[PDB]
Design a protein around this ligand. Sequence first.
Ligand SMILES: Nc1ncnc2c1ncn2[C@@H]1O[C@H](CNS(=O)(=O)NCCCCC[C@@H]2SC[C@@H]3NC(=O)N[C@@H]32)[C@@H](O)[C@H]1O
Length: 260
Amino acid sequence: MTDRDRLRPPLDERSLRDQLIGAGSGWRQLDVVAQTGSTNADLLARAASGADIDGVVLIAEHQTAGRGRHGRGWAATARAQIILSVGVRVVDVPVQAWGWLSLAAGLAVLDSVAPLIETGLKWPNDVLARGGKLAGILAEVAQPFVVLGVGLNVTQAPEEVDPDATSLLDLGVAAPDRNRIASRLLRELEARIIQWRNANPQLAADYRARSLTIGSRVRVELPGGQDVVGIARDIDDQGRLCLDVGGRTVVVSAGDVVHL
Ligand SMILES: Nc1ncnc2c1ncn2[C@@H]1O[C@H](CNS(=O)(=O)NCCCCC[C@@H]2SC[C@@H]3NC(=O)N[C@@H]32)[C@@H](O)[C@H]1O
């Protein structure tokens, strides 16, 4: 751990803005802060006060009260992760389509690190590698916006955050460069968001091609603490998980997947 700190230099905010903001780029604003409770909470607070957060990026070197799905947490230590939130205007898109945005986010994350490295997307949005959770995605709503949060373990050690975690460094990526990764990440997200906004079928085909969950036997932990065990067959037009339970189709809009 003490050694991993020597592989955690800070992000160059100036250089990242030079790469990501400007003509042709959807990103309107990027800031790197030293510390916050939750980048999602922060962009949601901005929007609740009237700010236009469409194409706004907030990166945090450290995150002390990270949020997960379904009232869970997200652990981080300083400079170990890429922790960021982006604002996406969604009010132009019918509400039944908004869950795709979270699927698209996980695809963006997976694609931006895949070349550096059992690996793929667990439905809905989380990125697994060698069975460990490599990145967490969390989208929340602040009309007319969705705030899309990513926490990507770059040099983060499982013993620092969670027993089931993995990171680029634990997958053997030598000394991962968070500036390079964050630029690849935010360029991938931009295209994926544009794809979502325009109902591009390539989004669904690329998600299916990256899914670890489709085809596998799963147990799905439903909101409310009921479990269903079936075989995940597909996602539908709303990105809902289609389960085969001994012949019957069960379509799940929210849940925690365990692969069996
Ligand atoms: N470091 C870490 N590595 C891997 N596993 C980790 C971890 N820490 C905790 N766990 C486990 O993962 C479970 C939660 N799983 S989840 O389904 O809720 N996934 C959704 C995750 C949300 C993404 C966070 C982003 S960061 C930018 C923005 N700002 C926020 O506040 N949120 C978003 C927990 O209970 C622990 O067991």
